[PDB]
Write an enzyme that holds these catalytic residues in place. Structure first.
Site, mmCIF file in Angstrom:
data_model
loop_
_atom_site.group_PDB
_atom_site.id
_atom_site.type_symbol
_atom_site.label_atom_id
_atom_site.label_comp_id
_atom_site.label_asym_id
_atom_site.label_seq_id
_atom_site.Cartn_x
_atom_site.Cartn_y
_atom_site.Cartn_z
ATOM 1 N N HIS A 17 -13.097 -19.401 53.194
ATOM 2 C CA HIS A 17 -13.996 -20.042 52.246
ATOM 3 C C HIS A 17 -13.343 -20.218 50.889
ATOM 4 O O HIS A 17 -13.482 -21.261 50.267
ATOM 5 C CB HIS A 17 -15.298 -19.250 52.093
ATOM 6 C CG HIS A 17 -16.017 -19.000 53.386
ATOM 7 N ND1 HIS A 17 -16.269 -17.734 53.863
ATOM 8 C CD2 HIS A 17 -16.530 -19.856 54.302
ATOM 9 C CE1 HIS A 17 -16.922 -17.819 55.012
ATOM 10 N NE2 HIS A 17 -17.094 -19.094 55.297
ATOM 11 N N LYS A 41 -30.089 -14.922 61.101
ATOM 12 C CA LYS A 41 -28.767 -14.424 61.461
ATOM 13 C C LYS A 41 -28.692 -12.905 61.346
ATOM 14 O O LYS A 41 -27.678 -12.324 61.730
ATOM 15 C CB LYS A 41 -27.658 -15.060 60.624
ATOM 16 C CG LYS A 41 -27.153 -16.379 61.189
ATOM 17 C CD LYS A 41 -26.160 -17.093 60.268
ATOM 18 C CE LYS A 41 -25.769 -18.458 60.841
ATOM 19 N NZ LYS A 41 -25.850 -19.581 59.847
ATOM 20 N N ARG A 90 -12.766 -26.383 60.615
ATOM 21 C CA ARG A 90 -11.620 -25.708 61.187
ATOM 22 C C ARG A 90 -11.562 -26.244 62.618
ATOM 23 O O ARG A 90 -12.228 -27.236 62.932
ATOM 24 C CB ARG A 90 -11.756 -24.185 61.061
ATOM 25 C CG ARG A 90 -12.360 -23.459 62.229
ATOM 26 C CD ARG A 90 -12.790 -22.058 61.842
ATOM 27 N NE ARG A 90 -13.500 -22.043 60.568
ATOM 28 C CZ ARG A 90 -14.025 -20.951 60.020
ATOM 29 N NH1 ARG A 90 -13.932 -19.784 60.646
ATOM 30 N NH2 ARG A 90 -14.657 -21.030 58.851
ATOM 31 N N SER A 128 -15.994 -15.114 59.661
ATOM 32 C CA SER A 128 -16.817 -14.028 59.154
ATOM 33 C C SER A 128 -17.329 -13.074 60.219
ATOM 34 O O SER A 128 -17.429 -11.869 59.983
ATOM 35 C CB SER A 128 -18.040 -14.601 58.439
ATOM 36 O OG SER A 128 -17.809 -14.732 57.061
HETATM 37 C C1 LIG Z 1 -30.964 -30.115 58.654
HETATM 38 C C2 LIG Z 1 -30.833 -28.924 57.715
HETATM 39 O O1 LIG Z 1 -31.274 -28.990 56.566
HETATM 40 S S1 LIG Z 1 -30.605 -27.301 58.465
HETATM 41 C C3 LIG Z 1 -32.224 -26.498 58.467
HETATM 42 C C4 LIG Z 1 -32.042 -24.992 58.655
HETATM 43 N N1 LIG Z 1 -31.740 -24.200 57.478
HETATM 44 C C5 LIG Z 1 -31.658 -24.556 56.119
HETATM 45 O O2 LIG Z 1 -31.842 -25.659 55.690
HETATM 46 C C6 LIG Z 1 -31.318 -23.461 55.148
HETATM 47 C C7 LIG Z 1 -29.837 -23.588 54.752
HETATM 48 N N2 LIG Z 1 -28.968 -23.019 55.777
HETATM 49 C C8 LIG Z 1 -27.518 -23.118 55.532
HETATM 50 O O3 LIG Z 1 -27.113 -23.627 54.521
HETATM 51 C C9 LIG Z 1 -26.473 -22.555 56.506
HETATM 52 O O4 LIG Z 1 -25.389 -22.310 55.712
HETATM 53 C C10 LIG Z 1 -26.081 -23.609 57.513
HETATM 54 C C11 LIG Z 1 -27.318 -23.873 58.396
HETATM 55 C C12 LIG Z 1 -25.745 -24.919 56.754
HETATM 56 C C13 LIG Z 1 -24.840 -23.215 58.359
HETATM 57 O O5 LIG Z 1 -24.660 -21.827 58.695
HETATM 58 P P1 LIG Z 1 -23.464 -21.007 57.985
HETATM 59 O O6 LIG Z 1 -24.047 -20.087 56.959
HETATM 60 O O7 LIG Z 1 -22.484 -21.945 57.324
HETATM 61 O O8 LIG Z 1 -22.671 -20.136 58.990
HETATM 62 P P2 LIG Z 1 -21.907 -20.898 60.120
HETATM 63 O O9 LIG Z 1 -22.857 -21.852 60.806
HETATM 64 O O10 LIG Z 1 -20.778 -21.657 59.454
HETATM 65 O O11 LIG Z 1 -21.392 -19.722 61.081
HETATM 66 C C14 LIG Z 1 -20.740 -18.637 60.409
HETATM 67 C C15 LIG Z 1 -19.245 -18.893 60.617
HETATM 68 O O12 LIG Z 1 -18.809 -19.978 60.073
HETATM 69 C C16 LIG Z 1 -17.999 -19.562 58.730
HETATM 70 N N3 LIG Z 1 -18.825 -19.994 57.688
HETATM 71 C C17 LIG Z 1 -19.911 -19.364 57.153
HETATM 72 N N4 LIG Z 1 -20.425 -20.189 56.200
HETATM 73 C C18 LIG Z 1 -19.647 -21.336 56.165
HETATM 74 C C19 LIG Z 1 -19.698 -22.511 55.397
HETATM 75 N N5 LIG Z 1 -20.672 -22.749 54.394
HETATM 76 N N6 LIG Z 1 -18.801 -23.515 55.563
HETATM 77 C C20 LIG Z 1 -17.813 -23.400 56.489
HETATM 78 N N7 LIG Z 1 -17.760 -22.246 57.256
HETATM 79 C C21 LIG Z 1 -18.674 -21.225 57.089
HETATM 80 C C22 LIG Z 1 -17.793 -18.254 58.727
HETATM 81 O O13 LIG Z 1 -16.351 -18.042 58.522
HETATM 82 C C23 LIG Z 1 -18.293 -17.736 60.100
HETATM 83 O O14 LIG Z 1 -17.338 -17.522 61.060
HETATM 84 P P3 LIG Z 1 -17.932 -17.399 62.574
HETATM 85 O O15 LIG Z 1 -18.038 -18.760 63.229
HETATM 86 O O16 LIG Z 1 -17.112 -16.580 63.545
HETATM 87 O O17 LIG Z 1 -19.244 -16.628 62.470
#
Ligand SMILES: CC(=O)SCCNC(=O)CCNC(=O)[C@H](O)C(C)(C)COP(=O)(O)OP(=O)(O)OC[C@H]1O[C@@H](n2cnc3c(N)ncnc32)[C@H](O)[C@@H]1OP(=O)(O)O
Ligand SMILES: CC(=O)SCCNC(=O)CCNC(=O)[C@H](O)C(C)(C)COP(=O)(O)OP(=O)(O)OC[C@H]1O[C@@H](n2cnc3c(N)ncnc32)[C@H](O)[C@@H]1OP(=O)(O)O
Ligand SMILES: CC(=O)SCCNC(=O)CCNC(=O)[C@H](O)C(C)(C)COP(=O)(O)OP(=O)(O)OC[C@H]1O[C@@H](n2cnc3c(N)ncnc32)[C@H](O)[C@@H]1OP(=O)(O)O
Lengths: 158, 158, 158
Positions: A17, A41, A90, A128
């Site tokens: 990140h 989560k 990635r 993560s």
């Molecule tokens: C249509 C929409 O509006 S979605 C509706 C549902 N929820 C919401 O609106 C609330 C907002 N939710 C979020 O912002 C969340 O961050 C989401 C839904 C965008 C994505 O989930 P994330 O927190 O990014 O975690 P992610 O899906 O990337 O999975 C975690 C993994 O990705 C990595 N990661 C965590 N956050 C991020 C990120 N912001 N960007 C890139 N990689 C990330 C981590 O290294 C981790 O590794 P892993 O795959 O082994 O676990």
């Protein structure tokens, strides 16, 4: 002016990140790290801990700020008046959940662009989840995360 | 000599794993099947049961040994003095994940090689997860697993 | 005659499945929407609610009927006398999982064909999971689901 919002769970924030944040702070006028509660989560660290760790890791970048949120991302991005979403790509997947995320957010926030960066090769393959699992088994994660994060994980599993 | 360590959850071991192990014993002098506790996965079978099943399925192979472990893989492979990691590759399938896994283990265990085999056409598409779910609904799983595993699955849900 | 069975959790049914169902009802004499209990997924809506939402969304198609079930798909399909499995590919989800599914079902129900359709571009990025999550946070989901589903989601979260 461009204001980019980088949303995520950051449980915890990693060097993956941070590379992306480094690069984005040199491209954009304003970078907001949006840490989502993500209660579903069952995050290892509390929202406040995740915001604080992300703040520590980015304290040296003047145009970068960190804030936590529990609301809909498409609502929160308007609230922040950001015009760009940042997500890291990635290899490889998902990705396709990212394509799906971008197309659903396009319907809910049509004026916000979805943009992707890919991390330095050196910090790709850092996840993560895997950082968490290695730490919980007492493995050394100092090459995947910042020292405050490494310390936070170590103390967390005691 | 090469001592190859094949680490998985094996919940339970399937004909896909069994194929890979047959093939691995014909290539290497020493094959250790490292059965991971994997508490996050909430295994259907206990570690002790999963090891007994893997022992049963490989007892006819003299260069093959089975052991359970609940520690960090990167620590356990050194206690086992193995210099090679074995993993199986199927349909895509969890293939990104094997790169990321290998990448992170190359940092934690620099001296251990990571290598991949693929099972016969006939045993691809077999997932221990679908085997668990089919068995739990009383579907016949005898064509995906060794007979001792088939009995254990039958007894598991009675 | 061909009788096609379209199984899924449909929690809830979306315009994504509805496009697939529309297309299937004009190809086949008889279409059965098979709603799986799927207790592990811990569905937002009860089986009975999901069956009802699926009826409401398809009642204008005379050759389409909806039924819920909690048994093995491979046995239930024999109960419904369908000779075709329909599965959609919500864009490019993991067609390798659908393969693993198809070939394992090829073993349990050899006389039933597995067939796939893809939805219109307009609906190929709708995920019922994300619909649940957007709705739970008070986001507008009227562009991903039929109005009864939107109303049902609205009533579920206040
Ligand atoms: C249509 C929409 O509006 S979605 C509706 C549902 N929820 C919401 O609106 C609330 C907002 N939710 C979020 O912002 C969340 O961050 C989401 C839904 C965008 C994505 O989930 P994330 O927190 O990014 O975690 P992610 O899906 O990337 O999975 C975690 C993994 O990705 C990595 N990661 C965590 N956050 C991020 C990120 N912001 N960007 C890139 N990689 C990330 C981590 O290294 C981790 O590794 P892993 O795959 O082994 O676990
Ligand atoms: C950095 C790292 O290496 S992790 C650090 C923290 N954790 C540890 O150190 C624990 C050490 N042990 C492990 O990590 C585990 O052994 C792992 C993840 C390497 C293996 O777990 P897995 O057995 O692969 O579980 P998983 O469900 O992902 O298996 C994938 C599929 O391939 C099959 N499979 C099971 N074990 C293996 C295996 N060793 N090799 C190939 N395929 C396997 C299964 O049938 C499974 O099917 P399913 O997905 O439908 O259930
Ligand atoms: C078939 C065998 O006997 S193997 C053992 C498995 N299960 C059984 O025997 C019992 C019967 N179970 C079923 O029929 C289940 O529906 C399954 C496992 C075959 C499919 O599960 P799904 O309904 O696809 O749920 P999934 O995990 O993909 O999540 C629901 C999603 O799938 C989508 N979806 C649901 N059904 C379908 C479908 N038939 N085709 C395409 N997309 C679907 C929805 O868009 C939804 O979006 P999401 O991923 O964002 O949540």
């Amino acid at each position: 002016m461009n204001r980019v919002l980088y949303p995520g769970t950051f449980d915890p924030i990693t060097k993956g990140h941070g590379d992306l944040i480094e690069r984005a702070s040199r491209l954009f006028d304003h970078v907001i790290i949006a840490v989502a509660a993500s209660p579903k989560k069952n995050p290892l660290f509390s929202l406040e801990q995740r915001v604080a760790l992300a703040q520590e890791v980015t304290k040296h970048l003047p145009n970068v700020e960190v804030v936590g949120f529990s609301t809909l991302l498409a609502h929160f991005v308007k609230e922040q008046k950001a015009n760009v979403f940042l997500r890291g790509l990635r290899a490889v997947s998902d990705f396709e959940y990212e394509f799906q995320l971008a197309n659903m957010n396009r319907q809910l926030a049509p004026d916000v662009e979805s943009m992707f960066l890919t991390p330095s090769e050196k910090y790709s393959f850092i996840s993560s989840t895997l950082v968490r699992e290695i730490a919980a088994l007492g493995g050394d994660i100092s090459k995947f995360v910042h020292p405050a994060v490494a310390d936070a994980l170590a103390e967390r599993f005691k």
